[PDB]
Amino acid sequence: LPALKLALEYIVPCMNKHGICVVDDFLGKETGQQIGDEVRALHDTGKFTDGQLVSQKSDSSKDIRGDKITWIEGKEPGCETIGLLMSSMDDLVLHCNGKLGSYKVNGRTKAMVACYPGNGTGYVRHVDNPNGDGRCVTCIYYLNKDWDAKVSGGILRIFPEGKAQFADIEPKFDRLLFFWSDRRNPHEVQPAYATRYAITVWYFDADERARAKVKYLVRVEL
Ligand SMILES: O=C(O)CNC(=O)c1nc(Cl)c2ccccc2c1O
Ligand SMILES: [Cl-]
Ligand SMILES: [Mn+2]
């Protein structure tokens, strides 16, 4: 439960061996429920987008939209338990530093809160960072109480590079997930038939991010 102990005795060895690490009961029921309440309040007050355009119909009232998102800094009114989550994620990662491969983590994104609305949409197979944009670790926290994928779908399926197999991860309440963001971990979200919430942060590697600046391209006027 102390972040350093979880980091050294579980996350570091699990990440270095498998590139994927699942931590259940990360924050406990009380805090997890508070975060759920904050995310549902965001949803109920219209703070999410309308959802990824999945099917563009000739009649636009027929369009199908999928995952909805909102970006959260962690200090907004009504988001402070999400901020607490983000701090706890940061504490874990920082207590791994120097031991997650050869990466040196020096920053992260804001939190991306995602809501799959339960209409049979998921997320196609993809790699989070396929082109060297600086992101080395993906961290996802799940909020869905009593989630059963045989009933509601929504499994996260990862295809770790170099295996004739995949890893199915249920989006279970108070579950934290780490995985390498690059091509080692292509993954997909299978169709969700119930409202499915998750909060993602990506962590940056100092070297990769520093040279991403070059490739991706700040101008000083003359
Ligand atoms: O939610 C999950 O278990 C896994 N989700 C994703 O891998 C995922 N990845 C990306 Cl890059 C996006 C990107 C935008 C919106 C939602 C995403 C998402 O749910
Ligand atoms: Cl093992
Ligand atoms: Mn992804």
Side-chain angles (χ1 to χ4, degrees), residues 2-28 30-46 48-56 58-60 63-144 146-149 151-160 162 164 166-212 214 217 219-220 222:
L4 183 62
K5 189 175 192 288
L6 183 59
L8 298 188
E9 295 182 359
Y10 185 60
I11 295 168
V12 165
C14 197
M15 286 294 293
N16 285 319
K17 185 165 180 189
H18 301 294
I20 306 168
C21 178
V22 175
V23 175
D24 276 316
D25 306 314
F26 179 44
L27 296 168
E30 180 186 31
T31 304
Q33 293 189 144
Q34 281 176 246
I35 292 160
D37 290 338
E38 289 186 354
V39 168
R40 282 187 292 277
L42 291 170
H43 181 256
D44 292 345
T45 61
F48 285 76
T49 66
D50 283 357
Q52 185 172 187
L53 183 49
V54 180
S55 183
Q56 199 170 237
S58 64
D59 162 68
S60 315
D63 290 348
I64 303 310
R65 290 186 174 266
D67 63 279
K68 308 176 210 293
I69 60 176
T70 185
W71 290 98
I72 295 296
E73 182 190 23
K75 300 175 182 181
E76 304 94 334
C79 297
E80 302 174 342
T81 317
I82 297 164
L84 199 60
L85 167 67
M86 297 166 70
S87 301
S88 310
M89 297 175 167
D90 294 347
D91 289 350
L92 276 180
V93 176
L94 290 186
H95 286 127
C96 299
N97 235 341
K99 298 175 177 295
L100 288 174
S102 58
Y103 296 128
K104 296 290 183 289
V105 173
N106 69 342
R108 62 153 166 82
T109 62
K110 296 178 202 278
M112 188 190 68
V113 184
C115 172
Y116 291 78
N119 62 346
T121 58
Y123 202 98
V124 299
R125 185 193 175 118
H126 67 288
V127 167
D128 280 357
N129 169 23
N131 295 322
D133 69 21
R135 293 178 286 166
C136 60
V137 174
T138 302
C139 181
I140 306 178
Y141 181 74
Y142 297 104
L143 291 157
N144 312 292
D146 299 309
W147 188 276
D148 189 349
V151 177
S152 306
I155 289 173
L156 164 66
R157 176 169 289 171
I158 312 182
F159 306 88
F166 37 76
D168 282 348
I169 297 148
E170 295 213 68
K172 281 182 176 288
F173 174 78
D174 201 27
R175 173 173 280 182
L176 184 73
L177 169 69
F178 294 99
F179 59 88
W180 304 129
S181 306
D182 69 10
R183 287 169 184 204
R184 283 174 289 183
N185 294 318
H187 57 282
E188 69 195 10
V189 179
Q190 296 191 328
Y193 296 101
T195 307
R196 180 197 187 278
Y197 290 108
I199 302 178
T200 300
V201 171
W202 290 274
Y203 289 88
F204 292 104
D205 171 71
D207 182 85
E208 185 180 321
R209 187 58 181 166
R211 64 190 60 256
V214 194
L217 218 328
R219 168 169 72 86
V220 181
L222 293 194

